Design a binder for this molecule. Structure first.
Ligand SMILES: C[C@@H](O)[C@H](NC(=O)CNC(=O)[C@H](CCCCN)NCc1ccc(-c2cccnc2)cc1)[C@@H](O)N[C@H](Cc1ccccc1)C(N)=O
Length: 426
């Protein structure tokens, strides 16, 4: 009986002095805003309905209209940024926080979902939600001895909303709020529900997307072994953020990187570096590029796990963005590796695919490769084997690729390749 109302009818209903008529119009409004094709959010907004919906949130005496208006507002707040703003400007945030305490689960859950949409909109709304004190009652809802006694959908919404409080940058969330949330998050990260695990991983991946101090704050909570385990999951919705998170951690200090290696991450990388999903392969290689920028003993652990041939593989054939990542991994490896580790690199076949990418119409990857070639010559210099390396590069057609770079637009390149020609090619 609340199917297909017009906005004018809804307004008439909501403007009556009759709580039941209001409830009926609100429900009608909810159903409109729920329809799949082009819900008329903006018409609803233009009709001045948000303030009325928000005031309906306070009707403790009429829980069904609390629920319908929460749902209606939620549909609106899950739209665009201006639509979300309209919900925030109607005073929704404290009214939703009050509803977290509702004795009716379906109402509390709706409030959880609404705050998640508002906080997920941007840094400023996220921080406004935190300032209105959302975190304490959100965490209080998860304060049970075993998470398994909570309804599955309920727990998924809470996790999702928690992950939005961790999301976005400029600024990152307040340090205080991260610390408040982190222990619950570590807990959710050990729960056995794929979606809760996915969203927990996303949350950790956001918190580790920053300066080493923020990375530290997560890593000191001991999540890395669990991340590595999730890194080995079969579900792509779990692997993807676990790898993003692991990728962020290895952009940190050598000590933070070492915890990733100690947890056994490198054992998962043969499958990641050959993963059929392009973005996994790409982020796996990025991750390697940060590990090969570590200490020589960390480069050595890459060698020991048999990962150099997989780096040669990615460099040889892959999506171009992934190959760019592999080039970095190589330059970083050659930059910091021992002479013996660089010799090993060449013996694995790095030279030919390295040269084939000198044909890439991209300035940065050329600089990166030319830099790597230079590092390898510097290793050959310490062994007096510069000439043998020269013959190697020449025979796989690499020399012609380098002379052609003499004839190149950018001159950071141009001149790097001429340094190479003069110095190592008669
Ligand atoms: C831009 C650059 O500053 C960010 N990436 C880093 O790895 C930063 N790391 C360092 O500077 C280390 C610290 C040493 C760490 C010690 N363990 N020094 C050696 C080093 C130098 C250069 C590279 C390099 C540069 C460019 C590309 N690939 C690798 C890697 C290591 C950027 O790529 N971030 C991603 C982008 C992305 C994420 C996922 C997929 C695709 C892209 C993101 N936030 O989404």
């Amino acid at each position: 009986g609340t199917v297909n109302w017009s906005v004018e009818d809804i307004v008439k209903g909501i403007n009556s002095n009759n709580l039941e008529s209001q409830l009926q119009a609100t429900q009608a409004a909810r159903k409109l805003l729920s329809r799949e094709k082009q819900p008329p959010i903006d018409n609803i907004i233009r009709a001045g309905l948000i303030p009325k919906f928000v005031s309906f949130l306070g009707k403790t005496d009429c829980s069904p209209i609390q629920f319908e208006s929460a749902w209606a507002l939620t549909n609106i707040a899950s739209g665009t940024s201006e639509q979300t703003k309209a919900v925030v400007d109607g005073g929704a945030i404290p009214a939703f926080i009050s509803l977290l305490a509702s004795p009716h689960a379906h109402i509390s859950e709706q409030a959880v979902w609404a705050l998640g949409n508002i906080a997920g909109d941007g840094s400023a709304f996220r921080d406004l939600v935190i300032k209105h004190g959302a975190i304490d009652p959100l965490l209080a809802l998860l304060a049970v001895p075993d998470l398994s006694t909570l309804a599955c959908g309920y727990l998924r919404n809470l996790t999702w909303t928690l992950s939005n409080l961790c999301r976005n940058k400029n600024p990152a969330p307040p340090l205080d709020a991260v610390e408040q949330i982190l222990p619950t998050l570590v807990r959710l990260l050990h729960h056995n529900d794929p979606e809760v695990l996915a969203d927990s991983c996303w949350a950790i991946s956001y918190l580790t997307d920053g300066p080493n101090e923020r990375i530290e704050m997560v890593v000191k909570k001991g999540v890395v072994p669990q991340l590595v385990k999730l890194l080995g999951a079969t579900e792509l919705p779990i692997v993807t953020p676990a790898l993003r998170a692991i990728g962020n951690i290895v952009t940190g200090t050598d000590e933070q990187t070492q915890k990733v290696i100690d947890a056994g991450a490198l054992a998962v990388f043969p499958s990641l570096l050959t993963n059929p999903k392009t973005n996994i392969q790409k982020e796996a290689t990025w991750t390697m590029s940060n590990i090969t920028a570590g200490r020589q003993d960390q480069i050595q652990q890459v060698v020991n796990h048999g990962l150099v041939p997989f780096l040669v593989g990615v460099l040889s054939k892959a999506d171009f963005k992934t190959q760019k990542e592999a080039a970095w991994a190589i330059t970083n490896y050659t930059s910091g590796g021992t002479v013996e580790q660089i010799v090993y690199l060449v013996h694995c076949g790095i030279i030919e695919p390295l040269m084939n990418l000198l044909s890439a119409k991209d300035t940065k990857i050329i600089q990166v490769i030319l830099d790597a070639i230079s590092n390898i010559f510097q290793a050959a210099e310490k062994l007096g084997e510069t000439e043998k390396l020269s013959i190697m590069i020449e025979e796989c057609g690499g020399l012609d690729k380098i002379e052609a770079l003499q004839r190149h637009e950018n001159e950071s390149v141009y001149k790097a390749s001429l340094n190479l020609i003069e110095k190592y090619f008669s």
